[PDB]
Subunit: 258 residues, 4 copies
């Protein structure tokens, strides 16, 4: 299936590892031009692989919580390419800020998660209009299921779903589609590192995986990326405002199944 | 139907007008004790009518965006009554902060809407546990439908739905239920005043009302209040994490109907 | 909270035990007049308690799968009371008809679960229009969660949610509201017919216990009342968090 | 994007026109082998175009309301191809059976719309297990929005959404994914009253195309959707979920 993404310029936030890295790599494979915005430099191996598929792919160091850096990085991207065709809002962290944590911790969580999705759309949308481009917001099942000690991240991820509907309405006349992908349990190096802090990492991984209905396994970053890149493409030309769950049945299938 | 809310102490934010006022009044009618947190003093007729139903009902002047004022007003409420049985998070404003407004405007919208729902829950929850009390979060259809030039409000209202699920999970063992009510178009004095700024206020009102499937009319504050107060009561003793739409069919019925 | 249901005539299908029984009992407590349509006679204790609350409460023996019996029982209800103010579609059975069962078994499940919700609405709607009455359809979380080995029941319960939206649209200009309640795990005779219990109870997030028929009834009766006067087309989940809260919680 | 559907055998019910036809054609383009089950023979122009893309694609005349024809047509497909990799349940008709119509008309609507989705799954699932294949159920926005005067179709379409969740659960351990696509307004043979309706579609004020429905359906059949199961994908230009008040 030709996604018609050749030479389309797409910014991917947190685009050098995990879900974001898989999205950047998939974009390169579809002959698009991914532009990675991330705090820390990508691995050499990642950059080598990306450049091999798409020599024009770029990486810009960006602290997304710094509004001026978002502004300037988008400006640099437009200066380089003259156009923007997509934005994937993906950077985030489940920072475990519960009800008990208080205002400052809650607001800091909104800065880490929610506020830069808005900032990035704010700076990208004026350019997406010209190309009838697209936005994909990566959210989390926690936006609708809860988790229990993560008010900051939950609030952020839910606001991202709401903003997906809002921006779809706002941009309908410009032909700019806005959709979300909702993962549940996705195996990434960061998740693997977190699991490694447990007494028995293999048992902890198995305990989490056991609850995923389809195959009792984690979703892969590639699985998230395939749906996200489909949504960026005109193959999804009448899909806007939607929340696509790519989660092995985690959110919607009977909790009682084993 | 006996709601068993007699002598139960319930804080209602923005509780002296519109939806909040109707919730306070219904609470008083059920012989609960509403405690109004609002920036401005309620009008005299409101206070008289409230006291007539419930002499112990109180008002505290509170700027909800000031964390210390939330903290101190909750403390004052505990000092006066010795207990807390419910929290209704209701204060908000649709401030029309679009994609083009930028960071400072978007964050200010979060402060006006989202952040004080968290602050109030943060300060109230430790007390609600002792009484196996309840929370109701008043949201907005815009959280799921979008509207188009109100990113700040939409994000806030969607985060409030997500937090409803989150807090329901967090507090399940303590028997504290958390639910949301989602209005669409509700006629209030403030809405009436906004409409009065148009060239032809009556035609504008008609334009909006024509789109509400059930009766082609606005929902009333009392209609919102009756579902909200039901949700505060042990009549809703196995309802938690839910979003109840009270909207005349606005959100879910075929857009094509006249 | 006054529900203003006094003297309102409400048919409750399967209304003499479990969820249906609690709905009838709650209606009687609110001084409404429940009219139980069910295949088998209610037990004496149920009738004693029901009549103590509402002496005019009635039971009519009805095989809901017989269209003629539905028609005639609605007519009999109108002959006795002169009006109809509510319909609660509730009768059903999780009959475990899976993918391997075949057409005939699947269709039989639709007859046992779905088709009489339509038939009852068909015969009741003209009377409900006259009183600007209300419908509540009792569905099941299985409509949205699935379960396994129960295609017939799941299809039926999902169709009932769809019909709730459809009838809400169809009847909006007549002021007849139509809503659904979605239970998950509720202790009833149907349930015991369907250890495994303790295992299932542990999976209900709120209190690790089954929902009570009384809890389902309180929401169902609220939805019949003018306290829900701008609620139509809605699906109210009364399930202790079963459907919507994180599957991983203990 | 390689969908890895090459030589995969997929039955498409009502697969010779409208949405079904577009799904069959897209499958052929992706080098899958669509097998059209439909009441009437497709037109020669369609068959020519289908053969140009996939010479192995076939059509079988099937009255889906006849359980035996379903059984025998599935058997013939397995005899011919040796495998089944996908089922697309799509055949149906909005037959306008309302509250006033009565039992017989309502049940006839269920036969026309709902019952053959079950029948086809019943006969296809053993073969789908063998290939770790997939099912896509095409539903309708009416399942969640209502419409008026169409209880039969609405009930059927809602049951199909429920069955998507049910079969996803039932078949999880066998690696068989089950998903649904929910169109709203799509210009087809089954489909000023028109200008009125198109104006209400938020994205572009125009109907969704069969090609758009097909692109999502075929993606869902493919291993690119390897951890998607039980889901309802709305492909509707924002019809179901965006603010009703927008112009
Ligand atoms: Ca397209
Ligand atoms: Ca109770
Ligand atoms: Ca895959
Ligand atoms: Cl205020
Ligand atoms: Cl503050
Ligand atoms: Cl019965
Ligand atoms: Cl099964
Ligand atoms: Cl056909
Ligand atoms: Cl009708």
């Amino acid at each position: 299936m030709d996604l018609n993404l050749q030479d389309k310029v797409v910014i991917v936030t947190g685009g050098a590892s995990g879900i974001g890295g898989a999205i950047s790599m998939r974009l390169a494979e579809e002959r698009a031009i991914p532009v990675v915005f991330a705090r820390h430099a990508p691995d050499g191996a990642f950059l080598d692989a990306l450049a091999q598929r798409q020599p024009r792919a770029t990486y810009l160091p960006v602290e997304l919580q710094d509004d001026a850096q978002c502004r300037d990085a988008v400006a640099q991207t437009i200066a380089t390419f003259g156009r923007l065709d997509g934005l994937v809002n993906n950077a985030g962290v489940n920072d475990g800020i519960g009800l008990d944590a208080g205002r400052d911790a809650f607001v800091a969580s909104l800065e880490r998660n929610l506020i830069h999705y808005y900032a990035m759309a704010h700076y990208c949308v004026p350019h997406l209009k010209a190309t009838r481009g697209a936005i994909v917001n990566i959210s989390s099942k926690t936006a609708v299921t809860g988790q229990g000690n993560t008010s900051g991240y939950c609030a952020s991820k839910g606001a991202q779903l709401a903003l997906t509907r809002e921006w779809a309405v706002a941009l309908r006349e410009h032909g700019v589609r806005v959709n979300a992908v909702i993962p549940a349990e996705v195996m990434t190096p960061l998740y693997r590192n977190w699991i490694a802090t447990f007494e028995d990492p293999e048992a902890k991984l198995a305990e989490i995986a056991a609850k995923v209905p389809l195959g009792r396994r984690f979703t892969t970053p590639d699985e998230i990326a395939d749906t996200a890149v489909f949504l960026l493409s005109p193959r999804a030309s009448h899909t806007t405002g939607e929340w696509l769950f790519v989660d092995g049945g985690y959110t919607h299938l009977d909790r009682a199944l084993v």
